[PDB]
Design a protein around this nucleic acid. Structure first.
Ligand SMILES: C[S@@+](CC[C@H](N)C(=O)[O-])C[C@H]1O[C@@H](n2cnc3c(N)ncnc32)[C@H](O)[C@@H]1O
Ligand SMILES: [Mg+2]
Ligand SMILES: [Mg+2]
Ligand SMILES: [Mg+2]
Ligand SMILES: [Mg+2]
Ligand SMILES: [Mg+2]
Ligand SMILES: [Mg+2]
Ligand SMILES: [Mg+2]
Ligand SMILES: [Mg+2]
Ligand SMILES: [Mg+2]
Ligand SMILES: [Mg+2]
Ligand SMILES: [Mg+2]
Ligand SMILES: [Mg+2]
Ligand SMILES: [Mg+2]
Ligand SMILES: [Mg+2]
Ligand SMILES: [Mg+2]
Ligand SMILES: [Mg+2]
Ligand SMILES: [Mg+2]
Ligand SMILES: [Mg+2]
Ligand SMILES: [Mg+2]
Ligand SMILES: [Mg+2]
Ligand SMILES: [Mg+2]
Ligand SMILES: [Mg+2]
Ligand SMILES: [Mg+2]
Ligand SMILES: [Mg+2]
Ligand SMILES: [Mg+2]
Ligand SMILES: [Mg+2]
Ligand SMILES: [Mg+2]
Ligand SMILES: [Mg+2]
Ligand SMILES: [Mg+2]
Ligand SMILES: [Mg+2]
Ligand SMILES: [Mg+2]
Ligand SMILES: [Mg+2]
Ligand SMILES: [Mg+2]
Ligand SMILES: [Mg+2]
Ligand SMILES: [Mg+2]
Ligand SMILES: [Mg+2]
Ligand SMILES: [Mg+2]
Ligand SMILES: [Mg+2]
Ligand SMILES: [Mg+2]
Ligand SMILES: [Mg+2]
Ligand SMILES: [Mg+2]
Ligand SMILES: [Mg+2]
Ligand SMILES: [Mg+2]
Ligand SMILES: [Mg+2]
Ligand SMILES: [Mg+2]
Ligand SMILES: [Mg+2]
Ligand SMILES: [Mg+2]
Ligand SMILES: [Mg+2]
Ligand SMILES: [Mg+2]
Ligand SMILES: [Mg+2]
Lengths: 85, 238, 95, 335
RNA sequence: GCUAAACCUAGCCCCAAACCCACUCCACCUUACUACCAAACCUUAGCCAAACCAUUUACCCAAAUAAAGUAUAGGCGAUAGAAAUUGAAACCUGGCGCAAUAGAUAUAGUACCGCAAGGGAAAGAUGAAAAAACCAAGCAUAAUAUAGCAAGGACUAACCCCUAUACCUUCUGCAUAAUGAAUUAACUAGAAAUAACUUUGCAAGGAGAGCCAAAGCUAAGACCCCCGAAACCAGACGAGCUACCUAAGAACAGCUAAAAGAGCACACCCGUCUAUGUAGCAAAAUAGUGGGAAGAUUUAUAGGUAGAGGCGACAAACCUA
RNA sequence: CCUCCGCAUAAGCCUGCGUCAGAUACACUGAACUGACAAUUAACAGCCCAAUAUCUACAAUCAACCAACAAGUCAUUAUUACCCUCACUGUCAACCCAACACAGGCAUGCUCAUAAGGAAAGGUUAAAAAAAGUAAAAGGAACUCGGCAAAUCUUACCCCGCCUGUUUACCAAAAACAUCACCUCUAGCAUCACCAGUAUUAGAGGCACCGCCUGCCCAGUGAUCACUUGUUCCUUAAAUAGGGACCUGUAUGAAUGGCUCCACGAGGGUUCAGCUGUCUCUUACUUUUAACCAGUGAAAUUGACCUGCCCGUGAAGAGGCGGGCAUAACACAGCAAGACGAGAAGACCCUAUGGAGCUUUAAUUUAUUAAUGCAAACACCUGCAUUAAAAAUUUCGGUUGGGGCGACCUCGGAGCAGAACCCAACCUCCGAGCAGUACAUGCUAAGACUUCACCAGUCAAAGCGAACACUCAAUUGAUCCA
């Protein structure tokens, strides 16, 4: 949520502007939990998953401030408990 | 707001159902449609627009007897109570439909085109080309939506390959599958258009509120002026 | 100008004055002639020379500029190679 | 502008010229609104021979040269060369340049404008007057002949006479424009009679007109402006005064030409008739109008003429030969 | 001599310090204070300044100071504005604060006003014990006697005589014009800098780090008002009046009529014209006369539509005078 | 003597004229004021109901004829489950909404004039003016803007609007709006409006019943048909002008304009006859008011006043100033000539770099919506761009009666300061927004002038370098920014 100048010039009108991410429903498999989940993701998180080498690695490695998902934290707790027990 | 639609009935019945007037308002409570409010109280009679509806534990063509042909407040056309087996239902009456008349509903498409009697409902495939039809469905087993106003008749123009071109009363052609069912003939209450309201009071009874007193300049806009043409406007006579 | 800042509660300098004028420590202000870069093709060499000058300001102008600048701009500066170094002090001035 | 001045000109012309010209008016109307055909008058002080060859390459023909040939099947002003394209050709001359000598090769101007100059039968060593010289064109053509011993250029507006100075400098060398050789004045032309009488062999009078061609196109300082409506009304009166003033300055036996740019018989025929009447009564001087039937006949090839004028000759614009309107009347002072 | 006047202390203000509140029982989200049944996160805008306005126009964010109103930013205008770096001493129970028109609005968020959100007062004074003098205005004591801004010069003597065009403020200037004042008491309106000047201290140095300095530096003294719009924006509160609608209701005598958004005409609804009334009975009424009075009628109850909006048989109508 | 009110219910209010005892907007030492005490008793009314399926075409109108249209206000069954009873709450009044014990507002039943409920006159007198009535000789609209009011109860028209209806609550009830009928535009469709609808429909609009007139840019002649023409291609460098195809499944045109006409109207105008105090021309009586007596007791207003007349002065205008004149002092009742009489609310003109509503072809936008294209993604969503709709923010310079059409705003010259400089607004005239010649139209520097400020603008000795700081009255534009 921000402002913009009309034609990229400060002398023009200032307008409210909202940039929204592109959303996709995708299916992911957790081998730690042995379950498939349908989740709303962006391309960023798909790239993050790819570089982490899997969803499980992505969830476990990524701290809370980067994940920015309650479900992500719940997944993390699930996986940590599986590994602990 | 606190608006709840009166259309709550889940089970079909021939009993007139108490209906609530909207006044042209929404669920929100604001007006969406002007010139609606407060006519004579009305009761809704549920209409089975699916003419080929075989009874429970029954299939194939069935026949019905017309019990009565009756005025309906909710629509321009007359309605008919029709009985078959142990079921009574309301349907849209044709131009020439009387009490004691027997009407047939079939799903049978004939290789040889069957003779089209006024009361009967047939698939468009069965019906000959050029027959006046009514109560048509866009999709097979959807239900009648298209020719159901008083004295309205569609024409089956042509039948190609499992498809049929019909002429809607607005002279617009429509593509329909041959399996779709239509009722033969013209709808009841011909010369409904010929009726004379006579006084302002009658429209008020029909639930039509008077038009706004505000004067509007024109229904259509003014043509937008292109860049070189402006000098050609506003010429003053001398 | 801002007599008292909201943040510090201090007098503020008008930055327009700094962009256009030089203060000599003796109290004089130096300026360029207006329109010295403008339409030189239509101007006489004498006029062009008059325009390409660094000129002093009125008493009234100096007083205005003093008020529009803080004390920082009025301090003695010992710049390493200052072209206006000699002009900072007045000599043989009687009243 | 809330109401264009050019629209008033159209309204004014339609009501008066339609009845004046009849079926001819449509043809004139379309020609007036269309683009003006131009003639190139070669500067004699420049390389006349080289320019003539150059313009001949552009498939332009010297009409006046052809006119001189058919003249002898008085004499016209010599040393005048104007190239114009053939009938039905829309070709434009390239913009003029300075020459080797430092004077411009040719002047682009209305060919019909030369006819008053040609009508005036200029002879060597003639003292000549132009009451309304500015902005130029005609007065330039006077100098081109080289028959002018003393030329006087006059115009009420010093703004327009300044433009003449620029034209004179560009085209005519300083040698030719010596002391009293070419005299330029910014004084009133009406009071010219009392200034000097019986001075000039030949006088060219080009009164202010409605400027039919110019009024239809150019909005700025239009005569048909409501602010200038009073000027239009007093214009027929003013025209007579100037023509009379020119006649006073003329020596007896001398010839004047009255040139007007308008189609209006009010500003063409009645002015000439009025001037004669005024001069015959007030000053008791007789003027004889010289017939230009021979003159019109010679120039039929290039210019179409309106053959209904009692006095003078009116050149009407045609879409074939889009030359601006020119009414020239030649007359001699008997006494 | 009446009305009155007078009073000192309830309490409050700013600090400092210290991190606050929270069940007798019973009742209380339904119409709160009623024993007992099938769903929150979401850029503030605008006034204002720029002498218009349209980009822009300080507003806490982790504790002094100094760097510094510097670098920077900005219709490079109005104005906005850092950081690196430096560096911070710790004793609560005090007051050159107010004393009933002050100090809290407060004796109290009460009375009262408003449908609601909301607005919001006033005032008390004995003495150790109540089981003990005079003074504002207004008047009265005590009405008045030719003549005149109300007085002054006077005079034996109040008046008589002579002299004298109320006060404030405004308009280019003028008052006598216009503005403001019934009168009394209380309350009610000039806030700060640079630079200069004056008086000290020290002096090529001054200053209790920073800053200035070609007699300057340090310190002190000494200059910058009050009341008033129509507006604009944000968040609430309003359809118990009224506009329209929804749900389920009610009312309409009598007479003529082939029988009706018919006629006469009650009740009922409205408000044509006149008169009365005009601080009224009434912030729109009364009396007469009128228009309609089975209907596009009138009306009770409950519900709905909300201001960048609603609603409208468009009158810019109505949306709590 | 009045009753256009009453009694009850609903709604609202909440102890608000019961008893006892006290002090004390006419008053009773009594009040509805203060304190204490007492009271409205359920049958009326409120407060209801086990579940799951399932049933319910046929108004009402004395419901019978007859006639409809706007199509309507009340119905169950099958199976399971089920045994305890009369609880709780409203019940008063002279009452509510209007700041009041307010000529107002206020639903229903019964009474349609009362069986119920009330009192217009504090006492007097009989002035004026004012208000409401009654009666009036002779005349009968002569009154007046107008038959307004009153009396009498009336005809024939004209204009406007078809009509009933609606509108500015609180100055406009109308010719305005709506309205049947007609016409135009838009839409081929389901589960929250339109609509449980479907082109004889629905929405957005125009006009205003009916009735009568008003209707072609469909390709031209010639004898449905040939042929140039219109439209598209190709040849042609490309054209001119030639080669080929089509115009033959149909078209109607006006949200166009006029014209009478029946009924109707608190519409605007005219008129017949009567009629009446409207008037000639006013009078008499009654009531209210009034004035006086007794009680209670406001408001606007007020610089102070010991508050006269005539003439003059103050650009008009004086109670108060000047010159004359007048003049014991005090009530009460009339009056409206003056006190630019008093209170708001106006209307007119002007001003503000003060607002707001409306409109657009004002400027700045497209944040929003809709569509499109390109990316992403494998139709939706997201990002970017474009196009429209819908709005949003902001403004509307100065001179010229005021308004329309015009003119003007900067610089130079003249009338124009007779003679240093400056200075004649407004007006009456003229002109300027260049141009030409150099190409040292290079550099630098004493001293000066100056359009009354500033900013700008002007002249110039000497010197360096060259050579042997141009003409012209104006001929012009700061900062920022690029
Ligand atoms: C139509 S122009 C002449 C055309 C010109 N000779 C040409 O050919 O281009 C007339 C001129 O006469 C001038 N003029 C008008 N009145 C005048 C008078 N009284 N005395 C002199 N010249 C006058 C006008 O100002 C104008 O420039
Ligand atoms: Mg319906
Ligand atoms: Mg309308
Ligand atoms: Mg501002
Ligand atoms: Mg207090
Ligand atoms: Mg207080
Ligand atoms: Mg006293
Ligand atoms: Mg005296
Ligand atoms: Mg006053
Ligand atoms: Mg409501
Ligand atoms: Mg309501
Ligand atoms: Mg209803
Ligand atoms: Mg009746
Ligand atoms: Mg009726
Ligand atoms: Mg009636
Ligand atoms: Mg209404
Ligand atoms: Mg209107
Ligand atoms: Mg209006
Ligand atoms: Mg209000
Ligand atoms: Mg009591
Ligand atoms: Mg009971
Ligand atoms: Mg009684
Ligand atoms: Mg009484
Ligand atoms: Mg009395
Ligand atoms: Mg009387
Ligand atoms: Mg009488
Ligand atoms: Mg009369
Ligand atoms: Mg009469
Ligand atoms: Mg009279
Ligand atoms: Mg009357
Ligand atoms: Mg009488
Ligand atoms: Mg009507
Ligand atoms: Mg009616
Ligand atoms: Mg009516
Ligand atoms: Mg009304
Ligand atoms: Mg009104
Ligand atoms: Mg009215
Ligand atoms: Mg109308
Ligand atoms: Mg009426
Ligand atoms: Mg009295
Ligand atoms: Mg009394
Ligand atoms: Mg008072
Ligand atoms: Mg007087
Ligand atoms: Mg006097
Ligand atoms: Mg009196
Ligand atoms: Mg006075
Ligand atoms: Mg403004
Ligand atoms: Mg503003
Ligand atoms: Mg000066
Ligand atoms: Mg001046
Ligand atoms: Mg020299």
């Amino acid at each position: 949520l921000g402002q913009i100048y009309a034609n990229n010039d400060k002398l023009s009108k200032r307008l409210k502007k909202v940039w929204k991410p592109q959303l996709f429903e995708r299916e992911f498999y957790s081998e730690i939990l042995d379950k498939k989940f349908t989740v709303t993701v962006t391309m960023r998180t798909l790239d993050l998953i790819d570089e982490a080498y899997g969803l499980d690695f992505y969830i476990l490695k990524t701290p809370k401030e980067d994940l920015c998902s309650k479900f992500g934290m719940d997944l993390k707790r699930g996986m940590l408990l599986r590994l602990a027990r | 707001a606190n608006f709840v639609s009166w259309k709550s009935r889940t089970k079909y019945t021939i009993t007139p159902v108490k209906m609530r007037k909207s006044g042209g308002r929404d669920h929100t409570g604001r007006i969406r449609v002007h010139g609606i409010g407060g006519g004579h109280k009305q009761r809704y009679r549920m209409i089975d627009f699916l003419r080929f509806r075989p009874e429970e534990t029954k299939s194939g063509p069935f026949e019905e007897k017309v019990i009565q042909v009756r005025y309906d407040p909710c629509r321009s056309a007359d309605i008919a109570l029709v009985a078959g087996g142990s079921r009574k239902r309301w349907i849209i009456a044709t131009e020439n439909m009387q009490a004691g008349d027997t009407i047939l509903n079939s799903n049978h498409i004939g290789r040889m085109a069957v003779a089209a009697r006024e009361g009967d409902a047939h698939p468009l495939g069965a019906l000959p080309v050029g027959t006046l039809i009514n109560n048509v469905e866009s999709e097979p087993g959807r239900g009648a939506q298209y020719i159901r106003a008083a004295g309205t008749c569609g024409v089956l123009l042509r039948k190609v390959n499992g498809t049929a071109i019909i002429q809607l009363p607005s002279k617009r052609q429509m593509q329909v599958l041959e399996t779709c069912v239509a009722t033969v003939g013209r709808v009841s209450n011909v010369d409904h258009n010929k009726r004379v309201i006579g006084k302002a009071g009658r429209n008020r009874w029909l639930g039509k509120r008077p038009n706004s007193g505000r004067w509007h300049r024109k229904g259509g806009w003014a043509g937008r002026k292109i860049r070189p043409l402006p000098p050609m406007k506003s010429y003053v006579k001398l | 100008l801002t007599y008292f800042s909201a943040r510090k509660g201090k007098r503020k300098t008008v930055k327009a004055v700094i962009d256009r004028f030089l203060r000599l420590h003796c109290g004089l202000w130096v300026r360029r002639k207006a329109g010295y870069k403008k339409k030189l093709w239509k101007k006489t060499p004498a006029r062009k020379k008059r325009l390409r000058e660094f000129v002093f300001c009125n008493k009234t102008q100096s007083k205005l500029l003093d008020k529009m600048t803080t004390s920082f701009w009025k301090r003695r500066n010992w710049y390493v190679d200052d072209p206006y170094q000699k002009y900072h002090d007045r000599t043989n001035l009687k009243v | 502008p809330k109401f264009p001045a050019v629209r008033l000109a159209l309204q004014n012309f339609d009501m008066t010229y339609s009845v004046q010209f009849g079926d001819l008016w449509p043809s004139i109307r379309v020609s007036l609104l269309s683009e003006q055909k131009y003639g190139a008058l070669v500067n004699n002080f420049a390389a006349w021979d080289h320019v003539s060859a150059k313009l001949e390459q552009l498939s332009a023909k010297d009409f006046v040269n052809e006119a001189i040939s058919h003249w002898e099947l008085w004499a016209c002003s010599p040393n005048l060369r104007c190239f114009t394209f053939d009938r039905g050709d829309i070709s434009r001359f390239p913009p003029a340049r300075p020459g080797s000598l430092g004077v411009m090769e040719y002047y682009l101007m209305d060919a019909a404008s030369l006819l008053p100059v040609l009508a005036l039968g200029l002879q060597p060593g003639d003292i000549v007057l132009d009451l309304c010289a500015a902005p130029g064109g005609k007065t330039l053509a006077l100098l081109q002949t080289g028959c002018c011993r003393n030329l006087a250029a006059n115009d009420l507006s010093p703004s327009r006479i300044a433009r003449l100075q620029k034209i004179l400098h560009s085209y005519v060398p300083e040698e030719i424009r010596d002391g009293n050789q070419v005299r330029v004045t910014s004084w009133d032309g009406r009071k010219w009679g009392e200034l000097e009488g019986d001075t000039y062999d030949r006088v060219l009078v080009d009164v202010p007109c409605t400027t039919d061609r110019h009024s239809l196109h150019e909005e700025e300082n239009n005569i048909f402006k409501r602010s200038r409506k009073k000027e239009r009304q007093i214009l027929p009166v003013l025209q007579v005064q100037l023509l009379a003033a020119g006649l006073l300055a003329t020596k007896p036996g001398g010839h004047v030409v009255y040139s007007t740019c308008s189609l209006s018989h009010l500003q063409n025929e009645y002015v000439v008739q009025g001037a004669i009447e005024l001069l015959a009564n007030q000053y008791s001087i007789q003027v004889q109008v010289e017939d230009l039937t021979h003159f019109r006949r010679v120039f039929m090839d290039t210019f179409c003429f309106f053959s209904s004028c009692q006095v003078g000759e009116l050149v009407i614009p045609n879409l074939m030969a889009n030359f601006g309107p020119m009414y020239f009347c030649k007359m001699r002072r008997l006494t």
